[PDB]
């Protein structure tokens, strides 16, 4: 029958979970041969001026940075970006896995390994006129249910020898100098899709967020691969933010976002500089190269002590709060690992700097005495210089292997970055009483971008829901 009351259906936006390719938006000049510019020209969408955000009201959503697929998607883009951008002079990657040749093609003699001897023995030559078709070999660490080593026939263009098989696959290709300048990259959801952005000043990357907005695109992010220190990332709106899925678990890393950035300045590679020196007036010996100085491999990373010291103090206080007040907070150098793990490795200009973070991570904060000592040392000093080295052969972060690149031509510039976060790994374990020890960590590049995408969630939009008056 209806009533005098008029019911108006409210076009309430409805949001549903979806995963799709995020379209990278960036402002870059096609003419430039720069790595990021050429990539943008190859595949990007223009960044819209003043996009703004649409704020959703009375909407609360549970966010999970770790679960957020966008991170994986971006990481894949990062991997592709680097692989095309930088071509090694020599690429080393293992080919074949745990394959050991015990018999060579065209052998009629069965050869067998003997464990007790530690040597190969001629098991027996075949009476019948049969010659081995393919390379016969055993697979290390592979045991059948029968308790037998798995044996895999190998067909190669060239016959491998007994006791061999499994090469380093040397790949040799051009490695010309290519300019690498990180350019912020926005990510925009495809039409019919939106990005939900948590607007909380302090959010740990997980849990319900009441303050949520719809954004077409993410904020611009520089694809910087860095170990130990998060470079040129987002700065905390409020106090230092420490994020971990499980603080209690020592294996889980702690990602620390800083309220203020810390300046890290390294120097070395740049464009070639041309100089001519006549020498000896010319006749008798003319125009060459003199003044070779030291080793270009050497570099210095300058970080202001006071700025770093305050940063450490803030982080330590936050850590102690999170864990609870009672355990000590200690910053210690890495236990070890590959150079990339051991030192703050990061790429500038297409070359990786390995900077020794030991000086950065050598402090105890539990006692006033320590605090006084640090203060006094700071007062005497000004900046901390970290020894940095550029290794032309670099361990590949994407996959297990080695990549080789050309040495720097000249110097004269400064490679600068903002330490916007710290990656901390806690030793933990039963025995570590009265103390908690944090060491710089890395190798899982995803983490670098997880911190960036923690607040971003990609959502599908379907036809608007209609809400009757109730």
């Amino acid at each position: 029958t209806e009533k005098l009351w008029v019911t108006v259906y409210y076009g309430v936006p409805v949001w549903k979970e979806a995963t799709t390719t995020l379209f990278c938006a960036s402002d870059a000049k096609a003419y430039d041969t720069e790595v990021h510019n050429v990539w943008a020209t190859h595949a990007c969408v223009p960044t819209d001026p003043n996009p703004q955000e649409v704020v959703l009201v009375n909407v609360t959503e549970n966010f999970n940075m770790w679960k957020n697929d966008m991170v994986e998607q971006m990481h894949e883009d990062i991997i592709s970006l680097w692989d095309q951008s930088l071509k090694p002079c020599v690429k080393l990657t293992p080919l074949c896995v745990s394959l050991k040749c015990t018999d060579l093609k065209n052998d009629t003699n069965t050869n067998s390994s003997s464990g007790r001897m530690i040597m190969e023995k001629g098991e027996i030559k075949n009476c019948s006129f049969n010659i081995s078709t393919s390379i016969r070999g055993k697979v290390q660490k592979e045991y059948a249910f029968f308790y037998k080593l798995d044996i895999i026939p190998i067909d190669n263009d060239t016959t491998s020898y007994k006791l061999t098989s499994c090469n380093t696959s040397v790949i040799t290709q051009a490695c010309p100098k290519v300019s690498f300048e990180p350019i912020p990259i926005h990510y925009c959801a495809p039409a019919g899709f939106a990005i939900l952005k948590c607007n909380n000043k302090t959010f740990n990357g997980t849990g319900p967020c009441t303050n949520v907005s719809t954004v077409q695109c993410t904020h611009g992010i520089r694809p910087v691969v860095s170990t130990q220190l998060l470079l040129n990332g987002s700065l905390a709106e409020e106090e230092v933010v420490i994020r971990s899925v499980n603080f209690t678990d020592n294996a889980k890393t702690i990602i620390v976002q800083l309220n203020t950035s810390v300046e890290i300045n390294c120097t070395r590679p740049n464009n070639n500089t041309r100089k001519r020196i006549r020498i000896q007036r010319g006749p008798g010996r003319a125009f060459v190269t003199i003044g070779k100085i030291g080793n270009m491999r050497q570099a210095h990373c300058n970080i202001s002590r006071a700025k770093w010291n305050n940063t450490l103090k803030q982080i330590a206080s936050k850590l102690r709060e999170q864990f609870g007040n009672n355990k000590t907070i200690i910053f210690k150098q890495s236990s070890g690992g590959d150079p990339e793990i051991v030192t703050h490795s990061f790429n500038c200009g297409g070359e990786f700097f390995y900077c020794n973070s030991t000086q950065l991570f050598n402090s105890t904060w539990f006692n006033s005495t320590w605090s006084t000592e640090g203060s006094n040392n700071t007062e005497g000093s000004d900046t901390i210089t970290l020894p940095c080295r550029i290794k032309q052969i670099i361990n590949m972060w994407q996959k297990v292997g080695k990549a080789m690149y050309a040495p720097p031509i000249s110097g004269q510039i400064r490679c600068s970055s903002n330490i916007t976060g710290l990656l901390l790994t806690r030793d933990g374990g039963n025995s570590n009483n009265e103390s908690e020890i944090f060491r710089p960590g890395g190798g899982d590049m995803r983490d670098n971008w997880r911190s960036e995408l923690y607040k971003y969630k990609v959502v599908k939009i379907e036809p608007l829901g209609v809400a009757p008056t109730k």
Partner: antibody
């Protein structure tokens, strides 16, 4: 002062392993580049390669990848690697003054049946 | 790689003769060259490092010159002790040697 000492003459059969070592003295081995050069009898000098502090090495096209040059900084020593077709005299060079100067006395490697 | 060629392969000369041996780089090496003298039974000796910089103990009569892809070493007055073999080396990155020039006594 600065002396480079190369290992004694080495005689090997074809395809046999020959490793020749040069030990540095009188300068900080780690801080300076070591160079390897081979000269065949009746033939000119052929530069094999150089080694840097970080173990990063350069090689000539002929020797590219096939030869690995390794240096033991702890003993201030360098090592080479070649074959019978390259049977010859091998020189280890160093550059303490950054002038591409000092050479070693040389090692004779004879590889024959 | 880069071809380093020096010529003539051998030069016949008398004592007191002025001898020019030319080293040519197939590609522009700019200023990165070195000159070495070698004698029978002897390791290479550095006459010139950086084709313009004199090594102490080298007589003035040795005269370097040239640039880019073309360099030449001129012996102003050739002497019995000078007679020998000569090599030109690229110094920019790959220390490649030239074919070699032998200066021998003309009779």
């Amino acid at each position: 002062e600065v002396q480079l000492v190369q290992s004694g003459a080495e005689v090997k059969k074809p395809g046999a392993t020959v490793k020749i070592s040069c030990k540095a003295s009188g300068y900080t081995f780690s801080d300076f580049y070591m160079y390897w050069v081979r000269q065949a009898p009746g033939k000119g000098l052929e530069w094999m390669g150089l080694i840097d502090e970080d173990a990063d090495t350069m090689y000539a096209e002929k020797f590219r990848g096939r030869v690995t040059i390794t240096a033991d900084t702890s003993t201030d020593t360098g090592y080479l690697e070649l074959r019978s077709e390259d049977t010859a005299v091998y020189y280890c060079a160093a550059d303490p003054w950054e002038l591409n100067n000092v050479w070693g006395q040389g090692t004779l490697v004879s590889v024959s049946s | 790689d880069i071809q380093m060629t020096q010529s003539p392969s051998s030069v016949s000369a008398s004592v007191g003769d002025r001898v020019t041996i030319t080293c040519r780089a197939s590609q522009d090496i700019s200023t990165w060259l070195a000159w070495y003298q070698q004698k029978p039974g002897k390791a290479p000796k550095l006459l010139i490092y950086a084709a313009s910089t004199l090594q102490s103990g080298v007589p003035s009569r040795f005269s370097g010159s040239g640039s880019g892809t073309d360099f030449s070493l001129t012996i102003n007055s050739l002497q019995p002790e000078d007679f020998a073999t000569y090599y030109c080396q690229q110094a920019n990155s790959f220390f490649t040697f030239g074919g070699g020039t032998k200066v021998e006594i003309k009779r």
